[PDB]
Design a protein around this nucleic acid. Structure first.
Ligand SMILES: [Mn+2]
Ligand SMILES: [Mn+2]
Lengths: 263, 29
RNA sequence: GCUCAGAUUCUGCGGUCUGAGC
């Protein structure tokens, strides 16, 4: 329509004309914000006790958000909780404003006096993400029902011979289609799922048996898909997974890092 | 772990936490 | 040029100045 699809997807020549780009700071910086804004989303969501799903739906709102507004006029550290908030409203595990705030605050301000609920400072804070939320809405054009790549990947898991031990190394790897890649604004959940697995099992050295009667075992999750691309992308994904300055004291390791438990 | 970069924010945490002599966070989130 | 520790009510989460160690 206006459009059904053309809405939230862009060309590499577009994210260069970022709207945070028409302002005085870098790409090397911006690429670096988003990952550090989603990164915050994670921390709080874990602290709030919400599904890793909601976290992801925020990360997609965030991504989708700053393709319309600069990071100069809406700082990532205050659109983050604004969106995690409206997210866990949508995916349905509500948490209440004063609950989000009280967390965000012990996120960003570890050694502070836990907030006075009556201070003009506070009754202005809440006054704000309230107005922000009206923005993060008017911005995603009220399109909050978000489709993820994990919904798909969950589809072609044991629908091939795949050791669980390395069959969910793709589930996990999807969530980076979000944290550290601009992927979610470029190609669809399917196409993007194809990648989070063709890469997942080149570290796992197990590969895909091709399906017998004349159709590839990856052409069953999306219609237009080439290795010419998927190889092209897993490059990006990796030289982006390693275009990172060793900041990977990594994302959903707080105390869920090591492969499950020994100690 | 850290949207809390050292330091351009790790820094303000130092500036805020050191108006802990009678001035307070204007904005604190 | 990175990156840690002190300083700054210059100021919204980024700009100054001063030391180490690499
Ligand atoms: Mn490993
Ligand atoms: Mn010497």
């Amino acid at each position: 329509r206006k459009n059904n699809n053309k809405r939230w997807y862009f060309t590499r020549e577009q994210l260069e004309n970022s709207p945070s780009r028409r302002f005085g700071l870098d790409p090397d910086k911006e690429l670096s914000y988003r990952q550090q804004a989603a990164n915050l989303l994670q921390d709080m969501g874990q602290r709030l006790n919400v599904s890793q799903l909601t976290i992801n739906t925020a990360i997609v709102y965030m991504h989708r958000f700053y393709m319309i507004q600069s990071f100069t006029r809406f700082h990532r550290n205050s659109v983050a909780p604004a969106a995690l908030f409206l997210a866990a409203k949508v995916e349905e595990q509500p948490k209440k404003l004063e609950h989000v705030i009280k967390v965000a605050h012990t996120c960003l301000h570890p050694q502070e006096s836990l907030p006075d609920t009556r201070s003009e400072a506070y009754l202005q804070q809440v006054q704000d993400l309230v107005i922000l939320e009206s923005i993060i809405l008017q911005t995603l054009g009220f399109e909050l029902t978000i489709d993820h790549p994990h919904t798909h990947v969950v589809k072609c898991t044991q629908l091939v011979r795949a050791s669980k031990d390395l069959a969910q190394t793709s589930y996990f790897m999807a969530t980076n289609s979000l944290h550290l890649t601009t992927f979610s604004l470029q190609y669809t959940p399917p196409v993007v799922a194809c990648v989070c697995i063709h890469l997942a099992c080149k570290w796992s050295n197990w590969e895909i048996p091709v399906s017998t009667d004349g159709k590839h075992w990856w052409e069953y999750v999306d219609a237009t898909v080439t290795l010419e691309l998927l190889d092209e992308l897993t490059h990006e994904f990796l030289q982006i997974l390693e275009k990172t300055p060793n900041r990977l004291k990594r994302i959903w390791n707080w105390r869920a890092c090591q492969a499950a438990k020994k100690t | 772990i850290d949207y809390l970069d050292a330091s351009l924010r790790k820094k303000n945490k130092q500036r805020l936490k050191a108006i802990q002599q009678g001035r307070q966070p204007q904005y604190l989130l």
